[PDB]
Symmetry: D2
Subunit: 320 residues, 4 copies
């Protein structure tokens, strides 16, 4: 049997021999068929809802994943996670885990005690994906609702639906249906081993704020973010990354002062492009291209561990 570690970041996503953590033992009690597929070890990394996630928990999680996958006996890692910010954690890991071994994030849109709880099947499927030979070198994945999503592309796109996860710019890379795993595509953007980021010696991540653009917008939130020590700002702009004039002036000021301003969009999908209506080279801004504000924040945070140069950060957004 392959050996897999499940890292829990909160409560049980399913249900209502010790693997080595009470949450994971409850999961194995709820979904006993998992034991036929793999030898499961368990650890409790944090005990929070995903809306309480912090960079400190991310760094801890990434370092631990790296240390687990460096072990000869460990075939893969599964992380149970709240759905609200699973995309951010998955993306962070996708650029910080230095292995080709599978890393799978999984959660549940419905409570484990609910009628028609999604967790049991999601978890079962996640274990099957983790142990599948074809999952090697796919990068970090999210497995939800019979679907396998690349971490670069995945987002929570609905407040409540069991099918809330989507990859709006590319679609799912594969399927998993009652444990049967099939890949149809893979990301051609560099991840994991190919990533230039290394967080092994990092204790705190740089501060990056996100601003929400709208008509009759303001400068006061840019200024508050500067005042609070923001190293970067993601601007979730109107349409193709467009700011209101008053806000643009403030962002220009921010940029001149050494804070990295990266243009994303509030709309939900598509690329926030270079050489559209905003003169990024003149104003000192970066275009985040085909990401979303929350995932752009993650990438900018990592970029800021290496550099605050406009051109080098643009190149990072145009690569990853």
């Amino acid at each position: 049997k392959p050996q897999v570690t499940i890292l829990a970041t909160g409560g049980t996503i399913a249900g209502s021999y010790s693997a080595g953590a009470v949450t994971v033992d409850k999961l194995l009690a709820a979904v006993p068929a998992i034991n036929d597929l793999a030898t499961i070890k368990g650890e409790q990394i944090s005990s929070i809802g995903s809306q309480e996630m912090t960079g400190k928990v991310w760094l801890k999680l990434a370092k631990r994943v790296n240390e687990l996958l460096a072990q000869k006996e460990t075939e893969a890692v599964i992380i149970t996670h709240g759905t609200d910010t699973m995309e951010e954690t998955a993306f962070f890991l996708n650029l910080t885990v230095k292995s080709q071994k599978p890393v799978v994030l999984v959660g549940a849109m419905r409570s484990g005690s609910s009628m028609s709880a999604d967790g049991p099947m999601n978890l079962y499927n996640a274990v099957n994906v983790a142990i599948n030979k074809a999952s090697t070198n796919k990068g970090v994945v999210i497995v939800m609702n019979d679907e396998i999503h690349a971490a670069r592309e995945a987002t929570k796109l609905n407040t409540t639906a069991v099918n809330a996860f989507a990859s709006p710019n590319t679609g799912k890379i594969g399927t998993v249906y009652y444990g049967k795993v099939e890949y149809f595509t893979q990301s051609v953007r560099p991840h994991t081993l190919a990533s230039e980021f290394d967080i092994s010696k990092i204790e705190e991540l740089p501060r990056v704020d996100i601003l929400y653009a709208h008509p009759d917008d303001t400068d006061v939130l840019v200024n508050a973010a500067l005042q609070a020590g923001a190293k970067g700002i993601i601007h979730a702009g109107m349409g193709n990354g467009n700011p209101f004039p008053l806000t643009q002036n403030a962002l220009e000021k921010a940029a001149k002062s050494g804070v990295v301003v990266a243009r994303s969009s509030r709309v939900g999908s598509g690329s926030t492009t270079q050489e559209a209506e905003v003169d990024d080279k003149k104003l000192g801004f970066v275009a985040t291209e085909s990401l979303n504000p929350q995932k752009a924040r993650v990438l900018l945070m990592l970029a800021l561990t290496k550099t605050s140069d406009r051109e080098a950060i643009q190149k990072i957004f145009s690569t990853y």
Copy 2:
């Protein structure tokens, strides 16, 4: 043939390199004359008058322009000879304008917003067809009492439901919680559904005597979030805050504490979501009655901001504002 006024809020959404000026007819505004020159088939469908209400990209829109636009639409539709109004508009904030109008226009006559995702000078510009289709929708008898609509990419979207969901695509407009209410294909209009949420004549909002709208900020939630943007919004005089929360409208704890403070101080805090679709629900993880918050339900942050702005012209009571979000 019916008489329709096209209100332009910026440049031409169709054509390039046109003249306004032709011997047979003008409409009363250069932008609109250029539209007619670019799409001459429009003149067979309706008698077109034109006005220039503003001259901006939609990313520069302001409450002042919205008030001006709404009052003018109300005037135009009060005229016996005016069958409908079409507003040409930038795509970036067309959804906010449409939604504002949907709650402030006191008529059953059609109001149609239309734009173009591609420049009129571009290869394969979408504006000419979008505009032609918009005119056909504006004059169609079935468009009466549908509320304010957006017409883009052969589709008719209810203002309550519409959003720009993509940065660049000609098909960027969607109604993610309900779909389009109708279609328009080479001018052929069909409706399949209609909103059952009150709009236009049935709206309780009235902006005829309003000069400035209340200030409502929007915040973007994320892990390791902060209190400093709530505080800055309070300091700047925010009457309301839309919180674009994680998942089903969930805040980070530090931010929640600041929002609770904001609520206690009389600022209306309304929970929406960053995710893109679905309802930010009551009686989920956030105790809204205890904390003093409103749940915006099936809107999005930007449209929730509009509704809260209008609500704040009448009241800042939590229960009354919740009822407004649960009605409109």
Copy 3:
């Protein structure tokens, strides 16, 4: 509390009339919402459905909703052809009272079975005051879909149901029901169809278009006594030439040929590439082949006139 009848046909629905009693044992919270009566109308997978079962079901629903004590009907049904049954009922049930169809994409004995929640939500929709006069609805995966618009769009997903031309009309989330839109196409009471005295429905075949297509399937359908043919055409309802010739023959012989599309969404339009008036064809517009077949079947109970059938497709 309101009285509701659940009709089982049934499919694989909740838990590991007896079927309805098992549902109530699996989802006991339903008993707090309504007084549930149960009947077994058929005992089949929905891939075995027939016009005889549809007629029986519709007559029974009409009888039940004519009763003063009956607030609504819920029909448990297999997912494969739920859309066809819902659409049929939408044009044949003569009442404003709610009719809700509900099923499950996963077996009731499966991990994470969808049936229990679907059923619970369906009862809540059936008894909601806003569900009156919405027409027949499908309730699946927290969503309320109008029968006219609904289709099964995926082979296996719990979210397989969609309304690709319009979206869902409402939501139901842990029993909380909200409507955001409603159909403006006539249904139920406003329908001109009446099946109370009908024992067999007219035969309507469906053909699948493709490059290098054939005439032999048109001919076989004619030979087998087809009163209508739905052609699931390429793109905007377009036939291969050999097939078109055969369909023209079929039309001249009195068989109604209606153009739909294989693509999955959008309207198969009039006045596109196919000269329908010349060739003798009807354009089905914004339906799909399977639902167009239902509507043509009903139309054929009243008429086989091209213009009248086009008017029916342009109305319903």
Copy 4:
């Protein structure tokens, strides 16, 4: 600048010597193309895509193979009607023996229409064809600023300019005013990796498609058998399920040596093995994550090599 051949299968997709009049009209309508590449043109057929036939597919595939064998040819672009572009693309994806780009492109709106999509689609298609990252992606469809893998692409709407989709996987890349970016690629074998070879083939095997529904029939199966069908795609209800009467007739067809492959009418997802239909007992193949029309193409090619159930199942589980 790179040399690219545009093969036209019908009229102009844009506007109202490269070596073919259609292609010269395209260059007149979209002159910016000439800055990107040296364009040669050929007229392979002169038809709407609803009139496509295997004969035109064979001709097209052989010609593409010839053109890409030429050192001077960087890529091929094929202008095509939208209705059956997905079939032609899928066929070429399994028959073109090269890593050089092959790009299919069309227009949902007529070139003479207001807001015609052809000019931009064509411009974008040339940019994709000449991009270095398009090598070894397989055959692609370029429409509405999107790059779709041939295996996954389908026309999903009757009229919309955004009618093309990849419902099981999404687009593999984007092209926006000529700027090309790939985000994914297919991991299913295509082009050079395909086992199919049509260089000596003159006619493809006959494969019919049947549309399933309640109260279904056996007469269409029988007519297809009578007409010489080597295979039948059954577009089944839900997860590839037949009506009983029809299943009996398909079982008969299978026993008689006709390959029966189960797909679905629904639009997306896999028609799976080991669901409600006992394929091994009845003699059927499950087409998995394709659609009826593309399953037909793959079965047609499979039938040039074998009519064995197990070998055809393996083909559907591979490509």
